[PDB]
Amino acid sequence: SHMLRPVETPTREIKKLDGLWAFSLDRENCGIDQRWWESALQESRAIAVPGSFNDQFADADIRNYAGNVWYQREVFIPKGWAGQRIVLRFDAVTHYGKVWVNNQEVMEHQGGYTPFEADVTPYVIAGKSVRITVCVNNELNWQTIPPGMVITDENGKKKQSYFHDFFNYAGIHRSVMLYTTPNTWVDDITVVTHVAQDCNHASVDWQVVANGDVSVELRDADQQVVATGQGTSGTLQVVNPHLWQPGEGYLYELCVTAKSQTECDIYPLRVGIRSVAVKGEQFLINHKPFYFTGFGRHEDADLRGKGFDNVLMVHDHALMDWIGANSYRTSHYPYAEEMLDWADEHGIVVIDETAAVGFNLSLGNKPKELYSEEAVNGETQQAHLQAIKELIARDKNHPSVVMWSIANEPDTRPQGAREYFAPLAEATRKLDPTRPITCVNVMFCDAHTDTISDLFDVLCLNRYYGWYVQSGDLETAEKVLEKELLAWQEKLHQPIIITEYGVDTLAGLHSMYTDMWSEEYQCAWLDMYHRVFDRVSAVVGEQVWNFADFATSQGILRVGGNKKGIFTRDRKPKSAAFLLQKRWTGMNFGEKPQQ
Amino acid sequence: SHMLRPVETPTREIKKLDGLWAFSLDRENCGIDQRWWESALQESRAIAVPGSFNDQFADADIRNYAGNVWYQREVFIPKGWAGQRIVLRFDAVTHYGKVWVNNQEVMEHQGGYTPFEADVTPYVIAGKSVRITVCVNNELNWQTIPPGMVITDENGKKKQSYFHDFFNYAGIHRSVMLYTTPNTWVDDITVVTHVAQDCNHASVDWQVVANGDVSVELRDADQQVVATGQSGTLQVVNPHLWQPGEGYLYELCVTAKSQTECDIYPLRVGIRSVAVKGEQFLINHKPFYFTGFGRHEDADLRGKGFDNVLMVHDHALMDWIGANSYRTSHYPYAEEMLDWADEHGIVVIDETAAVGFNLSLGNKPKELYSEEAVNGETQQAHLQAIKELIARDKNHPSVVMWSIANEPDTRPQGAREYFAPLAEATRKLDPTRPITCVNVMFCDAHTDTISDLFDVLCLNRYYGWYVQSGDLETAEKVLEKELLAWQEKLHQPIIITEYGVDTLAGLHSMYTDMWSEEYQCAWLDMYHRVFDRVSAVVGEQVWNFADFATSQGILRVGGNKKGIFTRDRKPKSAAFLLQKRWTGMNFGEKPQQ
């Protein structure tokens, strides 16, 4: 389904619906029955949008709730939008949302992390107030991405189980907006940027969907039109192009114009002229080997759960720049698109990942066979392929995105894993031939055990030697780590990114014994992993788990959450922060370090 | 001087300008000479609006920067706005803003904490993109509210010094926005809300400033019209009284009719009255007992920046702990907080940025009230600060009292003659609510001169902390003795507007000694036992709701640690001690004995 990022243009207006909404639980599950969307939510309180609903109220009972919740506000449609295509859009509703404009149901979506939107024109009058009601469901089952099991106790009270290591935050996490186009409008663009080997010339393929004649012009940073073309498709030539390079991010603008006899639409699409290719064991960007540094992240912070926030984005990017990070992965769900707009503009390299985590009952009563009709089945695979389609639909034109991760840490031991994953790998490549693909690999599915990694282009490993196994023993951990990395190099001859390596670290726990949970062990352990990486030629990246401490469901393994942060959840540095800064700022930009 | 909260109506639209702006420092103070507003800011970076610029970048050199900073962004004016009045409004810029539209200067403001707007219709074209540049200055001198002193070191690099115990956060802390009116518009409203002793009747006065034919209607909560007029009084049988802890709201719709154009503006109204009666604070002719906090506009990363989730959460916590009230220590808060307190029936002491009129808290002018310090030109700004606050909040039923200064020194030469003209000029700017002045720790019953000019006595006390340190026994006697001495002197209502001790979350002690969680509990306990045994005390506002940032010093362990909650909003044991007292008692009534 076509999904361009709304942008204000001579032909296009946006009105944000972010702010205080009315909010109500639905403990009874009668809000659909009683059509709660007809009148004011009856027992309601104020809530911030965007935000997770769970932590806004300092209330355990709302935090831990499973079921439906209701959001509602009134909004004036701009007078002067009369005779315009009016769209209502939600950047994200976690995990499921149904929307009513007054009494007309207009939208339904499953998938907590990518946008959905409807033509609401026939259900609103320009200059009049409208009521927008949302039913938001946070329940996971074997056909949701990610999967889960609702457990219903003898009293019929629901309790979400899930297999991923981060809290099941829900609500309207990202901006809600009414926006306009002319009734003739550009509905979809696809740009591919080819780059010659000598880097001295580049072609830009375009493809456009719009109910009118299409023209495009390519403008550089100085606004100088550098190329033009006509019709739904073609190829712009660019001599001596300003390449989009990691650390710089030079953007052109592709102005696409949809022109009927009466009216016209204008969409500016930012373009980074760059190519991305695996070549043996090297990850090439503009024909030059790249070395990833930086983090697995999460969309997580105090009070707002996974809600988008501009101060948080500005602050975290200052921290990643300070520390010398050149890259990250959207672990483990599509991130707010303003993150990909920031990366495009600042030349930050991103591994874009789906919400497909938790396909693994072995990370600790769960179904006996992971790949079966009672768990991951043909429906689950369909839901997964849909998850992949929406992510690529959103993110295909972000030059910051260099690789698709279609899943995180699935159990690949069973016969079934390869039957499930092979067609998803093939479909992903069809949806976007321009980027390499990966499936992030769990520690127990080692080089000798794993049955799917040959189907993907880049080997993305999550390794905790010296933490979950060889606990506290850097000596034995180093031998085991180096042995396995070389066994993967021999097995597949792919580029290897260590997408996770980290240890829980209590900020302020200090030890002369350099033992587990201390700041000092975090430092020694990352240091050991770095020496190993620098001795294996197939290793082309290191992404520390995690940028910051983050919330998980409660358990004996999590001291108030996951403490593998380099920074605390309030973004204060642990000692290891200064260790990463030395290594990452001390290396040459984008180049594998040396002994 | 006319300040109406922009709200959307059939005749009034709004576009928020909040989001990422371009941002630059101006170390070389050459921005105005090079007229930076004429081009895109050079060597800029993204900043979030709203929020302080100081903590967004984890960079000490920006955090501590003194001088001018530049914000810039482009924005499309909506096509349907052609032939309407286009305003540009900043809800707050700390401490000074000057604003250009393309190449045209449109406004200036001094005052970190209140709105300012210009009609920009002539310099914008609906359906075109225009560039908004803002030069924001964070410097404080003896004429700014609040005061400080700038030192230019050996290289022209400024270094700011100030006399208040909260960090000097600056930037565009609140919403920026374009909004429309018809060329005929409502431009101002005042509303007074008399309530007969019986309570079973009430009358609402209304004045309006509009360049067209004024008509008003007052609807109740269910949108049933309940009065009408064409200046005037509306009458109301068995009125729904705005009551603490409920906050019933009516809507005064105010129409401004030309033959050509019409303008509607709804204004929420709470039918309540507030007066002192001897030793009692009275709302709707009932004795009230204030509980809750001195607060701050302070949080991780965003500084004093307004945030929706933070507002929703902090209110959630106050609710849970049983707070009915707070003070806007020590500056006007974001209007949203008062729109909130209006709806939920929270009581608010609304306070000016006038704090640190003092040189003895914890090189500088040897005479506080002099030409080289707090002079007549200072008294003026202070009056201008009092004007702008009442111009914005005169209509909020939550605002139960004005606070015209916090912790002014009262010993130096000619305190009274400085303040007498301000307490007068306050009651003339609005006589509907009592006024107060917050009374610093060392300015005791004998020392203070000024208390007599004000309706309610607001004490900040710290016995057992800054004095009689860690001795709760000696601290109790000295506190009781002093609150009785204050009864005898003024027979006014006594609110403790600050009582708090620095408490390091996780510091546990068997010896119940200073900085421990246990000390915070045993000490608030003692202030509590005294409060109850003194008929004159009609309020207790704990200092502070949460840990907040200060300037660096030997007295501040990473900031002020007097919070009941940490900066990340986690409770200390004292959160549970206050929750028993404040919810175990009766809404708005002093406890027994």
Ligand SMILES: O=C(O)[C@H]1CN[C@H](O)[C@@H](O)[C@H]1O
């Ligand atoms: O902390 C950990 O152990 C890691 C393990 N690997 C998963 O991909 C992460 O979600 C996180 O749970």
Ligand SMILES: O=C(O)[C@H]1CN[C@H](O)[C@@H](O)[C@H]1O
């Ligand atoms: O923490 C303190 O000591 C208090 C004393 N009184 C002031 O009004 C507050 O701003 C704060 O400095």
